Amino acid sequence: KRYVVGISGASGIVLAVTLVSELARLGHHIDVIISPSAQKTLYYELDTKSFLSTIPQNFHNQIVLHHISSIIDATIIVPCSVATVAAISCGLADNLLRRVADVALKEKRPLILVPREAPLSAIHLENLLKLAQNGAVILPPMPIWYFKPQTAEDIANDIVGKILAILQLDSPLIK
């Protein structure tokens, strides 16, 4: 299958690494788009400058990195900053990340957004609501807890487990 994973500048790029690596482990193809703002979040959070170093080498044939300034079963924006939520909710399809979101909305194909921000102001909630009403799946990264997590790693994997469930996949990360 073919999945578009866009990585927006919000905190939690470990969610994106985990999704892509597991997607790739399931024999699927992934098109990844990294915003410059997430390219930095990548170094501050996983002390590394290449997103591809975080992925098992054997999966690299199944992954295509795209430049956000260039002029399909589902699209996932993870993490998704509020600025990217705003752009998508406005129709402001003026980079590749925003535009692949817009295409998903325009064709009624699955669009999963993973917004990290807290608190959420009325401005951001109104954009999320608009996107929900237009068919986007709004999936904030909420720890599941009744799975008795122990590590930070447990929490991330169960959050990604929720993503894969929505993608109608099966994976040992779903609980």
Ligand X SMILES: CC(C)=CCOP(=O)(O)O
- Binding residue ranges for dimethylallyl phosphate: 146, 162
Residues 6+ apart with CB under 8 A from 54: 17, 21, 46, 48
Residue 7 φ/ψ, nearest 5 degrees: -115, 105
Contact in structure between 124 and 117 (CB atoms under 8 Å)? yes
Other beta carbons within 10 Å of 39: 16
Of ligand FMN, its own copies, ligand X, none, which one sits near residue 6, judging by CB under 5 to 8 A according to partner kind?
none
Query: Nearest approach, Cβ of 28 to its own copies (angstroms)?
Result: 19
**Euclidean distance between CA atoms 89 and 132, whole angstroms:** 10
Name the site residues for ligand FMN (rule: CB under 6 A).
8-11, 35, 37-38, 40-41, 44, 71, 81-84, 93-94, 99, 116-117, 146
Nearer to its own copies, 28 or 130 (CB): 130
Query: Nearest approach, Cβ of 81 to ligand X (angstroms)?
Result: 7
15, 116, 129, 136, 166 from 142: Cα distances, Å: 12, 9, 18, 17, 15
Nearer to its own copies, 58 or 145 (CB): 145
Contact in structure between 103 and 135 (CB atoms under 8 Å)? no
- Of 155, 130, 23, the C-alpha closest to 76 is 23
Nearer to ligand X, 11 or 171 (CB): 11
Nearer to ligand X, 22 or 102 (CB): 102
Binding to ligand X, residues 111-150 (CB under 6 A): 117-118, 146
Binding to ligand X, residues 82-111 (CB under 6 A): 103
Query: Nearest approach, Cβ of 117 to ligand X (angstroms)?
Result: 5
Contact in structure between 143 and 152 (CB atoms under 8 Å)? no
Of ligand FMN, ligand X, its own copies, none, which one sits near residue 152, judging by CB under 5 to 8 A according to partner kind?
its own copies
Residue numbers of the site for ligand X (CB under 6 A)?
Answer: 11, 103, 117-118, 146
